Symmetry: D2
Subunit: 94 residues, 4 copies
């Protein structure tokens, strides 16, 4: 299954603007679906940068969006594919 890493650009501070990132990487998988979730809900208009190499069928995806973390709010990265029996959800931990 693809490697999934979830992290903020700068050290996380409540009420301070930051970037949420989900880095998805691996081999032998096309048409991967990636979403960022806020309190279980899909965040719309998330940007992404995609890199792939045919030589080893590798892919490296970065999904990111500007955000301001708080105590009440929980974030995660949701990855889906045909290879997966169910969407793989990875919670963000500061």
């Amino acid at each position: 299954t693809p490697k999934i890493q979830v992290y903020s650009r700068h050290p996380a501070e409540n009420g301070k603007s930051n970037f949420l990132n989900c880095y998805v990487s691996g081999f032998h998988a096309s048409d991967i679906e990636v979403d960022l979730l806020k309190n279980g809900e899909r965040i719309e208009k998330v940007e992404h940068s995609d890199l792939s190499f045919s030589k080893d069928w590798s892919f490296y995806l970065l999904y990111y969006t500007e955000f301001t973390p708080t105590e009440k709010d929980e974030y995660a990265c949701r990855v889906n594919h045909v290879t997966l029996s169910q969407p793989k959800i990875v919670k963000w931990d500061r």
Copy 2:
């Protein structure tokens, strides 16, 4: 229409191994088709590296393969898309 640049990795020398590259870049175009041609014929098993950014709908594609240029042989890059009325062919010039 996408920018297309065709070039060898090292200075071209007849009968000397090298890499043929076609660099295709632009904005607002998905599912672009790229082929390298030898004497008008599609070269099979060409590798490629693909990079794209959603922020500006940009793409940067590098199609490459190992080759040995000669006097008799002519090479080109063929790019196609729905946006194009006909495949755009760009001949390699040493």
Copy 3:
């Protein structure tokens, strides 16, 4: 000697914001120096992205700045390198 390409991000339109780029690539960066010029003067607000690989000692540099092209202004890229007898100045061909 290093390869030098000077180009705008989008087709130039006088009076409209754009980015001017100088892409410098080659092997053995050594004492490489790159600057963008306006009417012969160094542009202050220039940033750069640098990529290098020790395997083949290749380097790929992108020097860039936001700019507003006009009919009267001349832009160029100045490059100095050990392999050059004197600094090379490549004019932006609109």
Copy 4:
């Protein structure tokens, strides 16, 4: 201080060829020094890919080597930086 991640390209299998990676990232590279170690000894056949951006002074370094993991051998990455009181050694957790 710089972020340091040590990992193999594919899941480790004893006796099977793989790549060991040390990914070092942060802001203001300055006098950064990176090495891969086997049983405390510097590995000679290490290459690296370096990416940096002047906009935010970010840097992203990938130091890598082909290796054949075994049960007995210990690998690590050594990093020295101005922001570190002494060089940091991060062991590869298989």
